[PDB]
Amino acid sequence: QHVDAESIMTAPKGKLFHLQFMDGLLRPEPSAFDPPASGEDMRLIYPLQPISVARSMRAIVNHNEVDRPRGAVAPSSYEMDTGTLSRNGDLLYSPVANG
Amino acid sequence: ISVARSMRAIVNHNEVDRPRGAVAPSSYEMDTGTLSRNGDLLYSPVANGQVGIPKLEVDHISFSNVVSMMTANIRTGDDMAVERVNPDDVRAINIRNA
Amino acid sequence: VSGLLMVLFKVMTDNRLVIVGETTTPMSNTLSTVVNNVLRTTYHNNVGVN
Amino acid sequence: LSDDFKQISDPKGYLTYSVKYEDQFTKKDKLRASEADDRIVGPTVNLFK
């Protein structure tokens, strides 16, 4: 999808805009022999707030075969905690320490 | 005559005895040690103290070795290409000075 | 004797460059322990004999 | 009896994982789990490939 600056300045209030934002982290390095770019890719639209709130994980590939890529996101520990039922029935995370 | 022979009589006398004249494989056939500090193949050290003998130093055959290799094809297909750009005037070229 | 020269020649001119072929990464549990002690994570699908 | 509840098996959550792939990445080595470990671990692994 695309959004001209005109539309961003003139879209009615209360309409939900649907912006798109690339995660460029999984972009493999350019061939050594690709021609140089004389020009410059540019950008206008940015979020004011974090967008990736829904994101559990990111860049499930290896930098090298052993390093993590910069900006890679491991799953949160609580995604895997499956503790126990409370004395009354309610769900709980496992105790953090023995006490 | 049997210089080429690695092994012999791969069957059991009884179910547990070896047949007389049976030949087990030489240990070096299985040694697959390491690369030397410079790159060359070696047998494992014999004892804890001594360094491992180069495989090429001695007359044994070793049928396991560490082969270095690329992880994928080196012909990616991104062949180098250039922009040749000719002299503007053939008369103006400075042939001179080395 | 001719054979030996053409062996030596054919070796002096052996310009093969190895590339990793198809591999497998068996899980430890699939292998009997004696094999897992020899195996080092991945290995070529075309194991030779030994 | 009153139909107070909707008895069901193998429940669906309110939340689910979604996942976007860049298909050009693929590990060359091919992992071989036992069929059982594949039966359990597998649906996870196909998703987070």
Partner: peptide, 26 residues
């Protein structure tokens, strides 16, 4: 049935390296 003898030798498999288009790392 008569007793018999046979031979075997390990097979060659040395292919030219495959040209894959996939890549494993970022």
């Amino acid at each position: 049935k008569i007793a018999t003898a046979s031979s075997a030798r390990q097979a060659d498999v040395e292919k030219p390296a495959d040209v894959t288009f996939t890549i494993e790392n970022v």
